[PDB]
C-alpha cells in the first residue's frame, strides 16, 4: 500500500501561543489579553491563537491518514524551536517532506517514523512540531493499512505480547483549582488536579500552609461530591519548584513537608511534580534522587514526578537511570517524532519508573487521540486529558478514544 | 460493501446533564455543582456528567465507521426523551439495532438513514440521541465505502452539483460574555458571541439598556483587539424572548429597539435570536413574521433567528413558508437522524431562508465533525462551534475539520 498524496492545512488548537518572555517582563492584563509590546521573535501580540497543521496522507486504497503538527503554549520561548505559525511551516512540509512521502510504500511504523524524525533540510533538523505531526500521520497510515488500531501497531512494534488496557486519565485545572476540581470529580478523572501551584506567596504558602489546606480541601471535596463511594482518585499537584524555594532545597525540610501532605491526602495517594527547580540538570537530578531516597527510607508513599530539566529522550533516560523521582513526565510535543514517546515509556518501565504520557493544552483533538493510543500501547502510568483548558473537552477526547480503542482491540483479542 | 460488526462504548461529552426542574425549584449553585434533591426521572444528582455512546460499524474491508449518540444539556426536561444514560441505551442498540446492521449492505446514505431514523421498537420510536448517533455512523460508512468525505456524500444525495465551501463558524460565550469574547476575537470567529441574555432584569435591562451597552462594548472590543483591520464578524445575540417580554410583544416598539441595537453594532451586522417567546407556535410564527416585515420595510438590516416553537422539520417548513424570521436554528441533536438536518437546510435554501446548523455544548467531538460536514455540504449560513463551553476546543474541532474537508474535496474538484 502506497501513499499517493500529501495535503497540509492550517488549523487551531486547544489554546494560545503566549510570549513568555514578555509576560515575565511584566505584561499587564486586559480581559483575557495581555498588554504591552511583544518581546519574542514572530509574535505580533503577547497572546495569540495557537496554530496547528493537519497533515493528510492519502493512501492508494483511498483511505486518509491524519496527524496534527502542534507546539506548546510557550512556543518560541527559551529552548524551543521558533513560534509555530502555520504559514511559516506549511511550505517546508509541501516542498521538503511531501516529495519523500508520495510514492512511498507503507512498511512498519518504526523505520519510517525514525527517518522522518531525524530528516534534515539544509543540514538542519525539522521543527519539533512538524516531526510530531508527520509521525502521527505515519502511525495512522500503518494502522489503516493493517486495518488495526494505532495502539495495536505500537504494541506490536515496542511492547510485543502485552495486553492493551485502560490507562488512568489525568486532568489539569489551571488557576481555577476549585471549580475545575468539581468538573473532575463529576467526570471521575483517575488523577487530579495539577492545580498550577506556581507562586510561593499566593499558592504554596511561604511555609507551605496554603497547599496543606488545599490538599485537605480536595480530600474533602472528593468525599462530598463523588457519585460513588469507591471513586478513589490519585492526587497530582504540580508545584513548579516552589517547595524548593520555600524550604531552601533542604532535603530534610522538603521531605518533612511532603510527608504532612501525604498525611493530609489520606486516604488518597499523592504525587508531587517539580518540588524543586535548580540551576543545572545535574543538580536537579541529584535533588530529585535524594528527595526520593529520603521519602522512600521513611516509608512515606508519596511519589515525585520529574519535569524540570528533563526534556529530551536523553534526559528521560538520565532521570530514569538515576531513579530521580518515581515518575517522569513525557512531554509529547517536545519530543518530536511520536516514536520517541514509545521509546521513552518503554525505557522508564524497564527501570521501574512510572511514565506520565503528557502533552499540552495547546495541541489538538487528533494529536491527543494519537498519543492516547501510544500511552495505552506501552502501559503508561497515566495520560493527560488534552487539549484545551475547558476540562470537559480534553477528558472527552481522551476517554472516548480509549474506550473505542479497547472495544476494537477486544474483537481481535 | 457490508457491515460485519457493530460495537457500542459509553462516553463523555462536552458538558453536563442538568436537572432543569430541580434547578428551578431551588437547587444550590456551589462551585460547578448543584446541591439538593433531584426532580426529573432518571437523575441521581442535579448535575451529572453528560453521556454519549460511540457507535462503531466495522466494514468488510476492515475500516471502522464512527458516530456518537448524544443529547442536550437539559436531557429529560419538558418535551425531551428520557435522560440519556449510556448504561440504559447501550442494551437497546445492542439487542434491537445491531442485528439489523450486521450483514447489511452499504448503499446510499438517504434510504438507510431514513430507515433507522424511523425504526420502531415495541411500536415506539428510538430515543433521539440514538437516531443521531446511528445515522452519523451510517453517513461515515457510506463515505468510507466510496472513499470520499461525508460532505461529498451529503452533497451528492441532497445538494447535487453544488460546490462545497467553507461556512461561517459561530462561537457561544455562556455567561462569561466578556472574556470569552476576547477568545473569539483572537481566533477570528466569524459570528459571535451568543451572550446568553436570558433574563430581562439582569441581562437585557427593563428598557433594553443593558443589552444596548453590551452591543456597544462588543463593537468597541472587536475594534480594540483585532489583529487585522478587516476582521469584521457578525453579531448574533440570543435574547430568549426577553425583548418580547420587555416590550409587551408590541411590533413597533420591538423594532424601534432592535433598530437601536443595529445602530450601536454598526459597522457590524446584527442577528437576533428569539426576540419573543409567545404562547403558541402559530402566534410565534405570526410575531416573527410581523417583526421581520416591519424591519424589512423600514430598511433596517438586522436579522431575526427563529428558535422558539421551531423544532421539527415540519416546524422548519412552517417558519420558512411564512418568512417567520430570516434564519432558522436547526437544533441538530433534537432532530434525531442527521438526514433530517440536510432536509431542513435544503428546504430553507429552496425558500430564501438562512439555516443555522446548530447543536449543543453537550455533544461530542465526533458528532460535531459529522454535522459540520452536513452543514458545509448543504450551504448552511453558519455552523456552531461545539461542543463544550471552553470556546477554544469547539472552534478547533469544527474549523480544523472544515479545512481538512476542503483540502480533500479540492483533489477531486
Curated annotation (Swiss-Prot), chains A, B:
Entry note: thermal dependence: Optimum temperature is 55 degrees Celsius. It retains only half of its original activity after a 30 minutes incubation period at 50 degrees Celsius.
Result of altering residue 329 to A: Very strong decrease of the catalytic efficiency for deamination, whereas the affinity binding for L-threo-beta-methylaspartate is not affected
Gene3D superfamilies according to UniProt: Enolase-like C-terminal domain, Enolase-like, N-terminal domain
Required cofactor names: Mg(2+)
Organism in which the protein naturally occurs: Clostridium tetanomorphum
Subunit-structure text: Homodimer.
Signal peptide location: none
Highest taxon listed in the record's lineage: Bacteria
Family listed: Belongs to the methylaspartate ammonia-lyase family.
Chain's role: Involved in the methylaspartate cycle. Catalyzes the formation of the alpha,beta-unsaturated bond by the reversible anti elimination of ammonia from L-threo-beta-methylaspartate (L-threo-(2S,3S)-3-methylaspartate) to give mesaconate. It can also use L-erythro-beta-methylaspartate (L-erythro-(2S,3R)-3-methylaspartate), L-aspartate, fumarate and ethylfumarate as substrates.
Residues holding (2S,3S)-3-methyl-L-aspartate: 172, 329, 360-361
Record EC number: 4.3.1.2
Disulfide bond entries: none
Record protein name field: Methylaspartate ammonia-lyase
Family matches, as NCBIfam families: B_methylAsp_ase
Class of this enzyme: lyase
Stated consequence of mutating residue 73 to A: It has very broad nucleophile scope and excellent regio- and diastereoselectivity in the amination reaction. This mutation strongly moves the specificity of MAL away from ammonia and towards methylamine. It is highly enantioselective
Catalytic activity: (2S,3S)-3-methyl-L-aspartate = mesaconate + NH4(+)
Site (Transition state stabilizer): 194
InterPro entries attached to this UniProt entry: Enolase-like_C_sf, Enolase-like_N, Me_Asp_am_lyase, MeAsp_NH4-lyase_C, MeAsp_NH4-lyase_N
Amino acid at each position: 500500500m502506497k501513499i499517493v498524496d500529501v495535503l497540509c492545512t492550517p488549523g487551531l488548537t486547544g489554546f494560545y501561543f503566549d510570549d513568555q518572555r514578555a509576560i515575565k517582563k511584566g505584561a499587564g492584563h486586559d480581559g483575557f489579553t495581555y498588554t504591552g509590546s511583544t518581546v519574542t521573535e514572530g509574535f505580533t501580540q503577547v497572546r495569540q491563537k495557537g496554530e496547528s497543521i493537519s497533515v493528510l496522507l492519502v493512501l492508494e486504497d483511498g483511505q486518509v491518514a491524519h496527524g496534527d503538527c502542534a507546539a506548546v503554549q510557550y512556543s518560541g520561548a527559551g529552548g524551543r524551536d521558533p513560534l509555530f505559525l502555520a504559514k511559516d511551516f506549511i511550505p517546508v512540509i509541501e516542498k521538503e517532506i511531501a516529495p519523500k512521502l508520495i510514492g512511498r510504500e507503507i512498511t512498519n511504523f518504526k523505520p519510517m517514523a525514525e527517518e522522518f524524525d531525524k530528516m534534515t533540510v539544509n543540514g538542519n533538523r525539522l521543527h519539533t512540531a512538524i516531526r510530531y505531526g508527520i509521525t502521527q500521520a505515519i502511525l495512522d497510515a500503518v494502522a489503516k493499512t493493517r486495518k488495526v488500531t494505532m495502539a495495536e501497531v505500537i504494541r506490536d512494534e515496542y511492547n510485543p505480547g502485552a495486553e492493551i488496557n485502560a490507562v488512568p486519565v489525568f486532568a489539569q485545572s489551571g488557576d481555577d483549582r476549585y471549580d475545575n476540581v468539581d468538573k473532575m470529580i463529576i467526570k471521575e478523572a483517575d488523577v487530579l488536579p495539577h492545580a498550577l501551584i506556581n507562586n510561593v506567596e499566593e499558592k504554596l504558602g511561604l511555609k507551605g500552609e496554603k497547599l496543606l489546606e488545599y490538599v485537605k480541601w480536595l480530600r474533602d471535596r472528593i468525599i462530598k461530591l463523588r457519585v460513588r463511594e469507591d471513586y478513589a482518585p490519585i492526587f497530582h499537584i504540580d508545584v513548579y519548584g516552589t517547595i524548593g524555594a520555600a524550604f531552601d532545597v533542604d532535603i530534610k525540610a522538603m521531605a518533612d513537608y511532603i510527608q504532612t501532605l501525604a498525611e493530609a491526602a489520606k486516604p488518597f495517594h499523592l504525587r508531587i511534580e517539580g518540588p524543586m527547580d535548580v540551576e543545572d540538570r545535574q543538580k536537579q537530578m541529584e535533588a530529585m534522587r535524594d528527595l526520593r531516597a529520603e521519602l522512600d527510607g521513611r516509608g512515606v508513599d508519596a511519589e515525585l514526578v520529574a519535569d524540570e530539566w528533563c526534556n529530551t529522550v536523553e534526559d528521560v533516560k538520565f532521570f530514569t537511570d538515576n531513579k530521580a523521582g518515581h515518575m517522569v513526565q513525557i512531554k509529547t510535543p517536545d519530543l518530536g517524532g511520536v516514536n520517541n514517546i514509545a521509546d521513552a515509556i518503554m525505557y522508564c518501565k524497564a527501570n521501574g519508573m512510572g511514565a506520565y504520557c503528557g502533552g499540552t493544552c495547546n495541541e489538538t483533538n487528533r494529536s491527543a487521540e494519537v498519543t492516547t493510543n501510544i500511552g495505552m500501547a506501552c502501559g503508561a502510568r497515566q495520560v493527560l486529558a488534552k487539549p484545551g483548558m475547558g476540562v470537559d473537552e480534553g477528558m472527552m477526547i481522551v476517554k472516548n478514544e480509549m474506550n473505542r480503542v479497547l472495544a476494537l482491540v477486544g474483537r481481535r483479542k
